[PDB]
Amino acid sequence: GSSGSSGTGEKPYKCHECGKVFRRNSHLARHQLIHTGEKPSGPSSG
Numbered sequence: 001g002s003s004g005s006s007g008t009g010e011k012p013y014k015c016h017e018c019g020k021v022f023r024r025n026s027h028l029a030r031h032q033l034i035h036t037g038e039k040p041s042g043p044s045s046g
């Protein structure tokens with residue numbers, strides 16, 4: 001229950017797959033592609 005914030009602060013995401021840290025979340029999203037590849041949204045035949 002520790003208190004005390006450093007203003008706006010920050011919360012950089014860290015890839016648990018390899019251990020690479022990223023500034024924002026989006027940066028990590030594209031990185032995840034190297035690990036997982038699930039692109040359901042976007043039919044080809046249909």
Ligand SMILES: [Zn+2]
Nearest residue numbers: 015017018019
């Ligand atoms: Zn990674």
